Amino acid sequence: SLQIDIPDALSERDKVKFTVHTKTTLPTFQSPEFSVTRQHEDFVWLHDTLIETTDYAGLIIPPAPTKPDFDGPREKMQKLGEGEGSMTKEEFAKMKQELEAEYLAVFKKTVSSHEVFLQRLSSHPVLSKDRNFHVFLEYD
């Protein structure tokens, strides 16, 4: 078997990094449990590589996860930070909270999209064995 999950993730100015955690009993992998860090572009790399593999003609290939969009929150944030003398006391705290809620919503959506993609692959008889998928899970 081959179980994949994303237990944490990090939003920076220009990228989103996901921790990709694998547990497997399969002998092809270097070890039975490991974790790597991947950006969204690595998932798109994986998806496009699979789509372009001619031996996979006829196979259902799961759709790529959506591009995370933190642009709104991040800015509100970058400013609320520049506005340390911005009416808080309290308001700064209140605005930090509302913005955290906005980040949590985007994280929940995008972690779910990224994780479901990997899980669909893990269960695919052919794609689960793909060498590029293995690189994606193990490269560190």
């Binding site: 993730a9 939003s11 933190f70 944030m77 930090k96 949590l104 994280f107 972690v111």
Partner: peptide, 20 residues
């Protein structure tokens, strides 16, 4: 930067605004 932790053993994803 904002760090996300998926919730563990009952409870509750969390987010923290990263600081140094």
């Amino acid at each position: 930067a904002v760090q996300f932790f998926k919730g563990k053993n009952g409870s509750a994803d969390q987010v923290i605004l990263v600081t140094q």
